[PDB]
Amino acid sequence: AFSELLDQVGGLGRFQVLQTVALVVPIMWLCTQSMLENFSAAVPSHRCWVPLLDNSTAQASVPGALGPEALLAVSIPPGPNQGPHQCRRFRQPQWQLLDPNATATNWSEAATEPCVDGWVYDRSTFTSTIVAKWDLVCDSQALKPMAQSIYLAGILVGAAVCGPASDRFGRRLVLTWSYLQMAVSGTAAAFAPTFPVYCLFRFLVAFAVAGVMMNTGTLVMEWTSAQARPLVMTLNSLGFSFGHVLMAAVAYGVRDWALLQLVVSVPFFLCFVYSCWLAESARWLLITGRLDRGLRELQRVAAINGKRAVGDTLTPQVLLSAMQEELSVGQAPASLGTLLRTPGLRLRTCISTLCWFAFGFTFFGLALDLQALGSNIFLLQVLIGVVDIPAKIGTLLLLSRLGRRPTQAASLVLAGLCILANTLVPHEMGALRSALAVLGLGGLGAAFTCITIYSGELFPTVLRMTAVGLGQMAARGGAILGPLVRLLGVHGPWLPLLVYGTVPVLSGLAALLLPET
């Protein structure tokens, strides 16, 4: 509400703490849902089905016993990198390759056949996975990144429909509905019997996740007093950062693709159930002509906060008088027609959108394929969650005692350079590769939290909202475009990482030009 009314009710009190505690918790499950792909879409080694081994009759027919390692060569051509071909099989068994003396160069997939009878996967680490369930390998390999992109697409559409809708019906209504939709779609996706159904439900989940993300931030921002807004926003950001540790702790327990999704998405039913006693912001209520309900909510909060007499003395006349400032000037959002037209301000917008897209792209493109970065996914997830926090706390101190522009440029350049260096080092040293990847992700996180603050300060007060929205849309579009880059991995796994490392470096170098503060 207006500063006078909010101060009369109380800037900080019980209700603020209760609402913050209620709203931060779902944010950890809004990060578990986003990062569930690393564990529910893993790619295990997939040999080609062979009747000699799986069908026990044929194997037992041969007198004596033949070791599986020695009997595998006779029916699998030697694939690249001294391994078994992932999507080929011998047309007929070749006992000539059985003798180790003969060179295996003559034995190749020139006279082989495709995987007609299906693939055999590994159940040592993951008991089940979507890839092993719908054969998303070989010719369907490209279908794995696609599922990651569509989900991100949903998020982009959500902010396009949760923007105006929440400005007409309210904040709490949209938040509750989005919680319900998240819970229902997550519960339903676990039972999807075909790939397109799962993709559709994932897209709907992304839509609801965007709605929750916007509404939860708007509701927190409005109610908290002016002096304590960034302090609560950073807590809201730290919740999402602890979401990574939560994800790492959950996946280690259940090894499945349906149980994991169901367990992750079930708590949103409780989130919806208890989300009915949260108060609707009176700021939105009063401006939109809803006076009586806003007054009732204000009195309710005043009674909650421990000041009864103050709330009792309130009357609609004082309420109308105190909010005349907002009513007189009905600030209408200004379109881009008055933003890009001024030549002087063009560079600022260009560079800001460049930074927002660079981070939206590289961080989603790198985090989603967490396997290629290190050795074991669980340790990488835990370390990302642990390291994100200190970087996010230290960025604020850096900004206080150092310029915004140097900090932004240095963080972005260092993140990009660490990501790039991760590829060059060999695979013998898993520890160093994992450490470099973790540092790169932490740097990207720091750059993102710094640019969030930096963007608003650049432009005047009137044009800040349009620029922030443009940056968010750019940053979302880059996220969508991120996963698609992996389709170049056929040439080699190094090219996607090279691109992910080159983009942030150039963005950070460019971001040194725009003025300070």
Ligand X SMILES: CC(C)(Sc1nc2ncccc2n1Cc1ccc(Br)c2ccccc12)C(=O)O
Q: Does residue 155 interact with ligand X by CB under 6 A?
A: yes
What is the nearest approach in angstroms of ligand X to the Cβ of residue 152?
Answer: 7
What is the nearest approach in angstroms of ligand X to the Cβ of residue 216?
Answer: 5
- Three-class DSSP category at 248: helix
- Three-class DSSP category at 90: strand
From 38-46, 179-187, 427-435, 474-482, span contacting ligand X (CB under 6 A): 474-482
Judged by beta carbon, residue 77 or residue 471, the one nearer ligand X is: 471
What is the nearest approach in angstroms of ligand X to the Cβ of residue 265?
Answer: 16
What does the H/E/C string look like for 317-381?
A: HHHHHHCHHHHHCCCCCCCHHHCCCCHHHHHHHHHHHHHHHHHHHHHHHHHHCHHHHCCCHHHHH
Single out the residue of 195, 190, 176, 247 nearest to residue 29, CA to CA.
Answer: 247
Site for ligand X in 26-65 (CB under 6 A): 27, 34
DSSP 51: H
From 124-132, 347-355, 378-386, 472-480, span contacting ligand X (CB under 6 A): 472-480
Contact criterion met (CB below 8 Å) for 320 and 295 = no
d(CA 177, CA 460): 35
Judged by beta carbon, residue 20 or residue 187, the one nearer ligand X is: 20
- Three-class DSSP category at 188: helix
d(CA 397, CA 404): 11
Q: Does residue 213 interact with ligand X by CB under 6 A?
A: yes
From 370-378, 411-419, 473-481, 500-508, span contacting ligand X (CB under 6 A): 473-481
Q: Does residue 360 interact with ligand X by CB under 6 A?
A: yes
Contact criterion met (CB below 8 Å) for 211 and 158 = yes
Enter the tokens of residue 196: 């397109």
Among 236, 421, 465, 484, binds ligand X (CB under 6 A): 236
Q: Does residue 455 interact with ligand X by CB under 6 A?
A: no
From 8-16, 156-164, 232-240, 407-415, span contacting ligand X (CB under 6 A): 232-240
Beta-bridged to residue 47, according to DSSP, are 120
From 49-57, 65-73, 434-442, 475-483, span contacting ligand X (CB under 6 A): 475-483
Binding marks (x or -) toward ligand X, 240..269, rule CB under 6 A?
Answer: x-----------------------------
Judged by beta carbon, residue 148 or residue 305, the one nearer ligand X is: 148
Number of residues that bind ligand X (CB under 6 A): 15
Enter the tokens of residue 354: 């460049």
Which amino acid would we find at residue 180?
Answer: L
What is the nearest approach in angstroms of ligand X to the Cβ of residue 495?
Answer: 24
Single out the residue of 188, 243, 454 nearest to residue 367, CA to CA.
Answer: 243
What is the nearest approach in angstroms of ligand X to the Cβ of residue 220?
Answer: 8
From 44-52, 284-292, 332-340, 471-479, span contacting ligand X (CB under 6 A): 471-479
What is the nearest approach in angstroms of ligand X to the Cβ of residue 269?
Answer: 20
Judged by beta carbon, residue 107 or residue 357, the one nearer ligand X is: 357
Judged by beta carbon, residue 360 or residue 374, the one nearer ligand X is: 360
Enter the tokens of residue 419: 């990501």
Q: Is 89 exposed, middle or buried (0-12, 13-18, 19+ CB in 10 A)?
A: buried
Judged by beta carbon, residue 199 or residue 480, the one nearer ligand X is: 480
Enter the tokens of residue 48: 């080609």
By residue count, the chain amounts to 517
Site for ligand X in 433-452 (CB under 6 A): 445, 448
Q: Does residue 217 interact with ligand X by CB under 6 A?
A: yes
Contact criterion met (CB below 8 Å) for 501 and 420 = yes
Judged by beta carbon, residue 272 or residue 356, the one nearer ligand X is: 356
Residue nearest to ligand X (CB): 236
Q: What is the DSSP string of 115-137?
A: -SS-EE---SS-S--HHHHHT-S
Contact criterion met (CB below 8 Å) for 250 and 39 = no
- Phi, psi for residue 280 in degrees, rounded to 5: -80, 135
Q: State the alpha helices, DSSP H only, in 36-67.
A: 37-40, 51-54, 56-61
Judged by beta carbon, residue 199 or residue 475, the one nearer ligand X is: 475
Q: What share of the chain is helix, strand, coil (3-state, %, to 5)?
A: 70, 0, 25
Enter the tokens of residue 170: 């309210």
What is the nearest approach in angstroms of ligand X to the Cβ of residue 155?
Answer: 6
From 13-21, 132-140, 213-221, 317-325, span contacting ligand X (CB under 6 A): 213-221
Q: Does residue 237 interact with ligand X by CB under 6 A?
A: yes
Site for ligand X in 111-150 (CB under 6 A): none
Q: Using alpha carbons, list the distances in angstroms from residue 119 to 77, 115, 127, 134, 300.
A: 15, 7, 15, 11, 62
What is the nearest approach in angstroms of ligand X to the Cβ of residue 456?
Answer: 15
Binding marks (x or -) toward ligand X, 4..23, rule CB under 6 A?
Answer: --------------------
Binding marks (x or -) toward ligand X, 283..322, rule CB under 6 A?
Answer: ----------------------------------------
Binding site for ligand X (CB under 6 A): 27, 34, 155, 213, 216-217, 236-237, 240, 360, 445, 448, 475-476, 479
